[PDB]
Design an enzyme around this catalytic site. Structure first.
Site, mmCIF file in Angstrom:
data_model
loop_
_atom_site.group_PDB
_atom_site.id
_atom_site.type_symbol
_atom_site.label_atom_id
_atom_site.label_comp_id
_atom_site.label_asym_id
_atom_site.label_seq_id
_atom_site.Cartn_x
_atom_site.Cartn_y
_atom_site.Cartn_z
ATOM 1 N N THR A 184 0.827 -1.200 0.000
ATOM 2 C CA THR A 184 0.000 0.000 0.000
ATOM 3 C C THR A 184 0.863 1.253 0.000
ATOM 4 O O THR A 184 0.625 2.183 -0.776
ATOM 5 C CB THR A 184 -0.955 0.005 1.201
ATOM 6 O OG1 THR A 184 -1.399 -1.331 1.466
ATOM 7 C CG2 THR A 184 -2.165 0.833 0.883
ATOM 8 N N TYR A 209 -13.008 -3.984 -1.952
ATOM 9 C CA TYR A 209 -14.142 -3.430 -2.688
ATOM 10 C C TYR A 209 -15.232 -4.451 -3.004
ATOM 11 O O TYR A 209 -16.416 -4.114 -2.916
ATOM 12 C CB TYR A 209 -13.660 -2.750 -3.969
ATOM 13 C CG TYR A 209 -14.744 -2.125 -4.801
ATOM 14 C CD1 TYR A 209 -15.509 -1.073 -4.309
ATOM 15 C CD2 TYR A 209 -14.978 -2.563 -6.104
ATOM 16 C CE1 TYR A 209 -16.490 -0.478 -5.085
ATOM 17 C CE2 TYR A 209 -15.965 -1.979 -6.889
ATOM 18 C CZ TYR A 209 -16.720 -0.934 -6.369
ATOM 19 O OH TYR A 209 -17.699 -0.327 -7.140
ATOM 20 N N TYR A 239 -2.673 -10.513 4.568
ATOM 21 C CA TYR A 239 -2.616 -9.101 4.942
ATOM 22 C C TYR A 239 -4.045 -8.614 5.140
ATOM 23 O O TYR A 239 -4.820 -8.536 4.183
ATOM 24 C CB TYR A 239 -1.866 -8.315 3.867
ATOM 25 C CG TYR A 239 -1.808 -6.796 3.971
ATOM 26 C CD1 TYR A 239 -2.079 -6.123 5.155
ATOM 27 C CD2 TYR A 239 -1.450 -6.046 2.861
ATOM 28 C CE1 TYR A 239 -2.015 -4.743 5.209
ATOM 29 C CE2 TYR A 239 -1.381 -4.677 2.909
ATOM 30 C CZ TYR A 239 -1.672 -4.027 4.077
ATOM 31 O OH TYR A 239 -1.590 -2.656 4.100
ATOM 32 N N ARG A 282 -9.183 -0.268 4.776
ATOM 33 C CA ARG A 282 -8.967 -0.037 3.354
ATOM 34 C C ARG A 282 -9.839 -0.921 2.460
ATOM 35 O O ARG A 282 -10.218 -0.491 1.368
ATOM 36 C CB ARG A 282 -7.488 -0.259 2.999
ATOM 37 C CG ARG A 282 -6.551 0.862 3.441
ATOM 38 C CD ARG A 282 -5.117 0.598 2.968
ATOM 39 N NE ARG A 282 -4.165 1.590 3.469
ATOM 40 C CZ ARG A 282 -4.024 2.816 2.961
ATOM 41 N NH1 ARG A 282 -4.774 3.211 1.943
ATOM 42 N NH2 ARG A 282 -3.134 3.658 3.473
ATOM 43 N N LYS A 290 0.133 -10.242 8.086
ATOM 44 C CA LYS A 290 0.259 -8.817 8.444
ATOM 45 C C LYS A 290 -1.068 -8.328 8.932
ATOM 46 O O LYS A 290 -2.025 -8.159 8.133
ATOM 47 C CB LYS A 290 0.724 -8.021 7.234
ATOM 48 C CG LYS A 290 0.835 -6.536 7.506
ATOM 49 C CD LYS A 290 1.224 -5.884 6.184
ATOM 50 C CE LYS A 290 1.214 -4.379 6.334
ATOM 51 N NZ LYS A 290 1.466 -3.938 4.981
ATOM 52 N N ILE A 325 5.468 -4.702 9.582
ATOM 53 C CA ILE A 325 5.681 -4.172 8.243
ATOM 54 C C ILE A 325 5.242 -2.723 8.321
ATOM 55 O O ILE A 325 4.058 -2.427 8.514
ATOM 56 C CB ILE A 325 4.929 -4.976 7.175
ATOM 57 C CG1 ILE A 325 5.534 -6.384 7.058
ATOM 58 C CG2 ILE A 325 4.988 -4.251 5.820
ATOM 59 C CD1 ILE A 325 4.611 -7.414 6.394
#
Ligand SMILES: N[C@@H](CCCC[NH3+])C(=O)O
Ligand SMILES: N[C@@H](CCCC[NH3+])C(=O)O
Ligand code: NA
Ligand code: NA
Ligand code: NA
Ligand code: NA
Ligand code: NA
Ligand code: NA
Ligand code: NA
Ligand code: NA
Ligand code: NA
Ligand code: NA
Lengths: 292, 293
Positions: free
Chosen positions: A44, A107, A133, A138, A161, A203
């Site tokens: 990202t 999405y 992740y 997001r 993550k 991370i």
């Protein structure tokens, strides 16, 4: 190899928005010298969304080339279409990357079974280690511990993550996975807490501009010296927060530029330049960190 | 005007291998023509925009346009989370015959309000087609606020918004910042009639995939101020409005279309997966409540 301070590295650009190799070389040299454990390429923070498939692959291969065996590189391979994720993953098979970072589809909001079949199909089309992740703020979806436990039984699914900032997830996941399943924070402001509860590293976006401190903080956490780690964390906490005062990576790219680490702070739309207020805030945070 | 009433966010029917199935799409489009659907949104969220590549996406839009054959207007889904991608998708349908574009706020990368402004402005400046903004924070991580909508309404071909928050206060917060011909469309079926009774002009609807005539009548009754009769339809449809999201959209609506005989197969592309047993029971009961089964 998947523990400690891992930098989610920016993709430095020239003023036209194209990848700037000279600047990326400087950052990679900086991370080798700073003791960063590994580099996440095109996550990202690396603006994965706005690089096309070929530019994405090029940045990862550029990073691998410049790393020149001195620091391990993990490829961002996430996609919200399973076919896209497989194709990205296959592009890096036998490249020299040591593993992949693959985000939950964003999405289209798949189910937990959708996530299971998504990540399993990805893992079945590669030999590389896979790090799940989770970042619901997001993506619109939340990979739950139950599902992580199902996926940890898949051969090369080796860690996660965890970027919710919900610290209860650490031991919720740990009790469902084997001892060598890697647990990495993806939320800088809560990452030392995450490690103190049993996490193996972070991370990190803060590591882009405070690599030495972040590496030593994570090593101290690993050694159980949490009081000493917290002194560093407190120096770094304004950065942990204010690097998100505007959409990441807008602040951290400005901070890299301000420190001489990259030539320009240019991004690709829909990212836009840091505001006056944002510069003031990030500058104060960098000064609080002792970096300016 | 053209962008009012019941607008179907049409599924992309697939064969068993995940490829677009023209024969099933033709049946759906004939069905919407006979049902009085006002327009078709092609390759939106319900049309699995995420899992079609750029060429398949464009192919589905051109197929829908070709099959509609001028009988019903087609609105192309053109959203992207990279502005360059959104422009390039938009440019693909310039002078194609579509009447406008539906363009979602960038997802996953979480731009600021200024980033949304520059994104949609750049898109509008690379097209002559009408642009309908689309806000759905639950999917995107990003919330296009009314103030920003008002800013964007001053860009001449930005002409409306699909507001899918389900937060009904947005209707008049937006309407007081825009001209009276700025189109206000619900993107949340369960609150769509409420949205219209507050001043909304229509809905871009998933329920309309399987209850097209009911949805067309509900919106026309609302438009004429016949809210009591519109509410009767809404209560027939409310279990559908809800249970078509009992599992990730479009998993339930595709199964409902297959169960009604409207498409051949309910196949999707990963990471969508087939409907669960419990989901089929729930969607069947909602279809029966609507009188459709
Ligand atoms: N913009 C799309 C395509 C990504 C292409 C590879 N970086 C996405 O974010 O999924
Ligand atoms: N899967 C990516 C690329 C879409 C390609 C066009 N339909 C996205 O959702 O943005
Ligand atoms: Na260079
Ligand atoms: Na889910
Ligand atoms: Na599930
Ligand atoms: Na769980
Ligand atoms: Na494993
Ligand atoms: Na066919
Ligand atoms: Na558009
Ligand atoms: Na306008
Ligand atoms: Na609504
Ligand atoms: Na199904």
């Amino acid at each position: 190899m998947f523990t400690g301070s891992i930098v989610a590295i920016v993709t430095p650009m020239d003023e036209k928005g194209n990848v700037c190799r000279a600047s990326l070389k400087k950052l990679i040299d900086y991370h080798v010298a700073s003791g960063t454990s590994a580099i996440v390429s095109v996550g990202t923070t690396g603006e994965s969304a706005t690089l096309n498939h070929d530019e994405h692959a090029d940045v990862v291969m550029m990073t691998l080339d410049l790393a020149d065996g001195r620091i391990p590189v993990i490829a961002g391979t996430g996609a919200n279409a399973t076919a896209e994720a497989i194709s990205l993953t296959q592009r890096f098979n036998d490249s020299g990357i040591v593993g992949c970072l693959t985000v939950t589809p964003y999405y289209n909001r798949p189910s937990q079974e959708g996530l299971y079949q998504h990540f399993k199909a990805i893992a079945e089309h590669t030999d590389l280690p896979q790090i799940l992740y989770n970042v619901p703020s997001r993506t619109g979806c939340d990979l739950l511990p139950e599902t992580v436990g199902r996926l940890a039984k898949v051969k090369n699914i080796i860690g996660i993550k965890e970027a919710t900032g919900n610290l209860t997830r650490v031991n919720q996941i740990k009790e469902l996975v084997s001892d060598d399943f890697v647990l990495l924070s993806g939320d800088d402001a809560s990452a030392l807490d995450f490690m103190q509860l049993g996490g193996h590293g972070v991370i990190s976006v803060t590591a882009n501009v405070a690599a030495r401190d972040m590496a030593q903080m994570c090593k101290l956490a690993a050694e159980g010296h949490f009081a000493e780690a917290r002194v560093i964390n407190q120096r770094l906490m304004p950065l942990h927060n204010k690097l998100f005062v505007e959409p990441n990576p807008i602040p951290v790219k400005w901070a890299c530029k301000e420190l001489g680490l990259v030539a320009t702070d240019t991004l690709r739309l829909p990212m836009t330049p840091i505001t006056d207020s944002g510069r003031e805030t990030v500058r104060a945070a960098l000064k609080h960190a002792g970096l300016l």
